[PDB]
């Protein structure tokens, strides 16, 4: 029943912040943890209890761990609007960060805090009676988001061998990039996490950036802007876990519904509608799901094949209108499945109006939809990273920083070769 969220590094922590604020708003939970609707356990078997535990005082506490090799970002958490939402033992910090170096996050610095983190996770798992697994939020380009995440994922596959681990990965973009070696970190972490992750939702920072500029009319999007949008989509994905739906009701069903091919576990997410604060039908929002401008990852699904397709509606949505809209799209555009996949869409509806954060940039809408689709087109995202990797690695540029931090140079090649094979994997499917 219960899910534990782990937020790693600055990206993962700040996105965690946005997500949990949104969660509290959706569930009627106040910043101090009180919920004027629920009863004390009880009474610990409700839908939202998969994400929140209950204190004997009526306090609803996020089943979450925040981890960063530097205190600054998490210090804002224990000194903010939701400081009383988390017990301080859930907020773990070190002193020296990974300095945008995977090798420091995974090897040199990360080994000094991995046991403390695993222990704080153990406490939460101890409060669980039927732990499903973990939702792991982190960046590709950060030293901690890459290195420590891959380390933690390995150790979690050891200590909790028989349970699902899902990822929300922040894919790097030059607009908000803070490190030249971000392509290195992305490839390194994708390599050592691949066999440890069951399903991973990549968030392209450039896609989110473009959507903020275009659909929210924000000139220079900040992390707060991006995170509130990212938060809205994470919410659309985890809603079935927090609201007891009929589609994707547990973490296992995510792999079942989206990942028929273990190595190819990167669903493309598409969200609609995104409207500025300055009413679309089921058909209009459903059609927008097949508009690449609304994707969270920049790629062209017209140049790819589908392995799976889930539609996640929320709001004033009638099932008959959904099926009608699907029948239109399934016979109006050009949706191509692999021959070894049903071809039919999986539909889930949540009859609550979508929630927005007060003071946000998003309009309240009557109905929204998030399409999760496993398409081979997302291989484009990997290709781009691999291209940047190959350009630097050919000269061994900035490789000395990694070698000097407990990492062997050969681990670069091995990681890149795995990526090469992953591209081949996508190629064999889309043909």
């Amino acid at each position: 029943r219960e899910c534990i969220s782990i937020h790693v590094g600055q990206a993962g922590v700040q996105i965690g912040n946005a997500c949990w604020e949104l969660y509290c708003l959706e569930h009627g939970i106040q910043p101090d943890g009180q919920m004027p609707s629920d009863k004390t356990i009880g009474g610990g078997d409700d839908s939202f209890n998969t994400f929140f535990s209950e204190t004997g005082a009526g306090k609803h506490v996020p089943r979450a761990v925040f981890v960063d090799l530097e205190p600054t970002v998490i210090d804002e958490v224990r000194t903010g609007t939701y400081r009383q939402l988390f017990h301080p033992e859930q907020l773990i910090t070190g002193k020296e960060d990974a300095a945008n170096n995977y090798a420091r996050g995974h090897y040199t610095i990360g080994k000094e805090i991995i046991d403390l983190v695993l222990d704080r996770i153990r406490k939460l798992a101890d409060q669980c009676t039927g732990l499903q697994g973990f939702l792991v939020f982190h960046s590709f380009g950060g030293g901690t988001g890459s290195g420590f995440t891959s380390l933690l994922m390995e150790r979690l596959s050891v200590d909790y061998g028989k349970k699902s681990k899902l990822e929300f990965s922040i894919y790097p973009a030059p607009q908000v990039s803070t490190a030249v070696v971000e392509p290195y970190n992305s490839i390194l972490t994708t390599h050592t996490t691949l066999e440890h992750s069951d399903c991973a939702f990549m968030v392209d920072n450039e896609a989110i950036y473009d959507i903020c500029r275009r659909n929210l009319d924000i000139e220079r999007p900040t992390y707060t802007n991006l995170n509130r949008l990212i938060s809205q989509i994470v919410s659309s994905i985890t809603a079935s876990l927090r609201f007891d739906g009929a589609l994707n009701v547990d973490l296992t069903e995510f792999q079942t519904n989206l990942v028929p091919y273990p190595r190819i576990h990167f669903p493309l997410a598409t969200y609609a509608p995104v409207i500025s604060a300055e009413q679309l039908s089921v058909a209009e929002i459903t059609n927008a799901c097949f508009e690449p401008a609304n994707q969270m990852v920049k790629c062209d699904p017209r140049h790819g094949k589908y392995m799976a397709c889930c539609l996640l509606y929320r709001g004033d949505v009638v099932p008959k209108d959904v099926n009608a809209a699907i029948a239109t799209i399934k016979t109006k555009r050009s949706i191509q499945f692999v021959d070894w996949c049903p071809t039919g869409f999986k539909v889930g509806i949540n009859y609550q109006p979508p929630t927005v954060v007060p003071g946000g940039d998003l309009a309240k809408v009557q109905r929204a939809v998030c399409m999760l689709s496993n398409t081979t087109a997302i291989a484009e995202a990997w290709a781009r990273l691999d291209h940047k990797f190959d350009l630097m690695y050919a000269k061994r540029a900035f490789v000395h920083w990694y070698v000097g931090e407990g990492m062997e140079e050969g681990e670069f090649s091995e990681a890149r070769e795995d990526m090469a094979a992953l591209e081949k994997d996508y190629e064999e499917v889309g043909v």
Binding site: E96, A99, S177, T178, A179, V180, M392, F398, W401
Partner: protein, 424 residues
């Protein structure tokens, strides 16, 4: 990554060091007594980086330096226990600073260093200001660096190193001292800001129209540079915020860690800088040789990596646009095999006297022009063996000159290699 320990050695090191402390104290609202009288939360946010009181250590084999320091405006703010001064003075002899009088005083300095290091919550590393043309700042400076490098291998070593020019000092042994120092710097520092006196003079003489540049005029430029390049360390930010993140972004190959700093606008002392520069103008100065604190032309090489810091009230949108513009319109000047090699930071707090300014930290292959200059002079002198007995008479061997010369020529060749390098 919080505290940086500042060290200033020799006359030049102490002059530009003093100026650094004067400039950043004014920026952080600190008065000569150490009291805060600023009016911004941003000023004290990261005050613990350079202040405890300045985390500075003052060194010279020339005792008289002490006086010039404490007779300065902010000379009273320095801890009296952090003054480590000898009784002689090396007299432009790198060997005396490196093996003889400097080696005798070095441990006294290391004690002060260690004393500051212990009371640091999270030591970033070290920051040394010095010249390479003398005996103390160059010779003893590079000794300290090796000693600290061995005692603190896991900390960043950073220097502001000023390059000798015949246009400022007509001492012929300076190419010796500089070459011997660079030999140490290439091996023992993580990042080095090359502050060329040739460039400082040229800028003062031909651009700022000063017929006779003094050290005060040169140091005006050095200080503006120093506040510019440490902006991201001293104010809350997300890019190149500590010594290690900067080095990771700036240094693709360990030996190639010598930066060509530049900034705009170029102001004179006391002058009335009116009609501040626009974002596009500041941007374009990145390729302007006249704005470089190293006497090299960026157009004569290729950028491996760049850090661009804009200070003042301006549009991040326009800054983003102009930086993209200057890159794609001058793409062949940026090495193809390092994608997205230019990082940009915008700080809301501009330097004193100016409304908007830009500082550029370049790792460019064009920096070989600097080393080529020194080497030529070193080789001119070394082939006639003039004044060599000064150095051998202090313990050195002629082989150290050869090894240093050879290593610097290797550095030049390496810059050339990556300048010709193709992505293909």
């Amino acid at each position: 990554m919080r505290e940086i320990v500042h060290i200033q050695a020799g006359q030049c090191g102490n002059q530009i060091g003093a100026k650094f402390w004067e400039v950043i104290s004014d920026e952080h609202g600190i008065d000569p007594t150490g009291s805060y009288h600023g009016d911004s939360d941003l000023q004290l946010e990261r005050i613990n980086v350079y202040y405890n009181v300045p985390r500075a250590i003052l060194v010279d084999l020339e005792p008289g330096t002490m006086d010039s320091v404490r007779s300065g405006p902010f000379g009273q703010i320095f801890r009296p226990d952090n003054f480590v001064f000898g009784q002689s003075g090396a007299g432009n002899n790198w060997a005396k600073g490196h093996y003889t009088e400097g080696a005798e005083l070095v441990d006294s300095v290391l004690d002060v260093v260690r004393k500051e290091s212990e009371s640091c919550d999270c030591l970033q590393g070290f920051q040394l200001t010095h010249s390479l043309g003398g005996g103390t700042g160059s010779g003893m400076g590079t000794l300290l660096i090796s000693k600290i490098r061995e005692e603190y291998p896991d900390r960043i070593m950073n220097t502001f190193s000023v390059m000798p020019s015949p246009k400022v000092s007509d001492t012929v042994v300076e190419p010796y001292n500089a070459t011997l120092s660079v030999h140490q710097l290439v091996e023992n520092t993580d990042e080095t800001y090359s502050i060329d006196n040739e460039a400082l003079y040229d800028i003062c003489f031909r651009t700022l129209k000063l017929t006779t540049p003094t050290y005060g005029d040169l140091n005006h430029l050095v200080s503006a540079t120093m506040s510019g390049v440490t902006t991201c360390l001293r104010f809350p930010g997300q890019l190149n915020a500590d010594l290690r993140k900067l080095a990771v972004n700036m240094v693709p190959f360990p030996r190639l860690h010598f930066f060509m700093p530049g900034f705009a606008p170029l102001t004179s002392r006391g002058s009335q800088q009116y009609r501040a520069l626009t974002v596009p103008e500041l941007t374009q100065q990145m390729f302007d040789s006249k704005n470089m604190m190293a006497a090299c032309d960026p157009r004569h090489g290729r950028y491996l990596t760049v850090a661009a810091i804009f200070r003042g009230r301006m549009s991040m949108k326009e800054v983003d646009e102009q930086m993209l513009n200057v890159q794609n319109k001058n793409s062949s000047y940026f090495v193809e095999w390092i994608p997205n090699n230019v990082k940009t930071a915008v700080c809301d707090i501009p330097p004193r006297g100016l409304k908007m300014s830009a500082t550029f930290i370049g790792n460019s292959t064009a920096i070989q022009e600097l080393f080529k200059r020194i080497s030529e002079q070193f080789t001119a002198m070394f082939r006639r063996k003039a004044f060599l007995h000064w150095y051998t008479g202090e313990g050195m061997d002629e082989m150290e000159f050869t090894e240093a010369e050879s290593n610097m020529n290797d550095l030049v060749s390496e810059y050339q290699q990556y300048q010709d390098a193709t992505a293909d």
